[PDB]
Amino acid sequence: STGSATTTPIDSLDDAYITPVQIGTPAQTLNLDFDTGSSDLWVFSSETTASEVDGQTIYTPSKSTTAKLLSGATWSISYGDGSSSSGDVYTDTVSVGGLTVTGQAVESAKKVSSSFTEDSTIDGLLGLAFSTLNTVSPTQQKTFFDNAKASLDSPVFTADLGYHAPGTYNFGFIDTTAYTGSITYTAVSTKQGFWEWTSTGYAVGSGTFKSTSIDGIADTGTTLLYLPATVVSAYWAQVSGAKSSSSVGGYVFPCSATLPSFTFGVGSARIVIPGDYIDFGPISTGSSSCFGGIQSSAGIGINIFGDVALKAAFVVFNGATTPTLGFASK
């Protein structure tokens, strides 16, 4: 089997991407944030504290003939941005782009933190990291990809995110029309539960390539590119007037600037992020200070190849027995 679904930016900055997912019988379609950096599928629901729902579409398990309470199971998760959610668990039928999983754990939120409430465009998350990170207790649950793997034509999914435009998540096949050149595959460590790999270096604009190993995660659920402070300083040094602001919380630059590209290495291959992809707009409405899309990872504990980097590539998440990542230009 295969599946193919379009993913759409939630706003004009590509702050996140939403993909329609069918849950239950008859189908209830919710727009979920596909997150290769976490492993829970959770939804706003009829159980979510009413004051914490503000425009989201909810899953109502009582209206699904295929929903079954997973008795005793609870979940609770906190994300790298300080947001969090928790609740109980049902199993139900979940389909993404024509690909159906029966018995998928659907984690129903009883509580969500303010950032989720305040974002009316995201109805929940669909985690695509390794199932060892799933938070359901006392019985850990598998991701949608893990459940579907055995049925897929090939045990892979691909992320093809758009710049200021929709893109595609495919399951079970590699669309050879979606990229240029060849796909370069690179080794993955699953030891932290992430799609963790090692970049071979970077360049800033037309500058020379610096060969240096950068360990990080391919994370579709993180907006920006978070790299070591040395790398980030080298990039922003090429933008007149750019500076790190503690009051804003990262590098800002004059909105009048033209940003240089940023290249990252995948083995001997090179992925080029155009400068425009690094512009996240005024820090506040009408400001002439703009927020940068490449930021320091120093406060995180891990480097994050988020959407800013991934949207410059066609990305293969290969879930074969020994997982690997593939990157192609497009």
Swiss-Prot record:
Keyword Signal: yes
Shown residues in whole-protein numbering: 90 to 419 of 419
EC class (word): hydrolase
Protein name as it appears in the record: Endothiapepsin
Family label: Belongs to the peptidase A1 family.
GO MF term list: aspartic-type endopeptidase activity
Superkingdom as given in the UniProt entry: Eukaryota
GO terms (BP aspect): proteolysis
Disulfide bonds: C255-C290
Gene: EAPA
Coiled-coil portions: none
Swiss-Prot/TrEMBL catalytic activity: Hydrolysis of proteins with specificity similar to that of pepsin A, prefers hydrophobic residues at P1 and P1', but does not cleave 14-Ala-|-Leu-15 in the B chain of insulin or Z-Glu-Tyr. Clots milk
Active site per UniProt: D35, S199
Residue ranges occupied by any Peptidase A1 domain in the UniProt entry: 17-328
EC number: 3.4.23.22
Keyword Disulfide bond: yes
Organism: Cryphonectria parasitica (Chestnut blight fungus)
Keyword terms, alphabetized: Aspartyl protease, Disulfide bond, Hydrolase, Protease, Signal, Zymogen
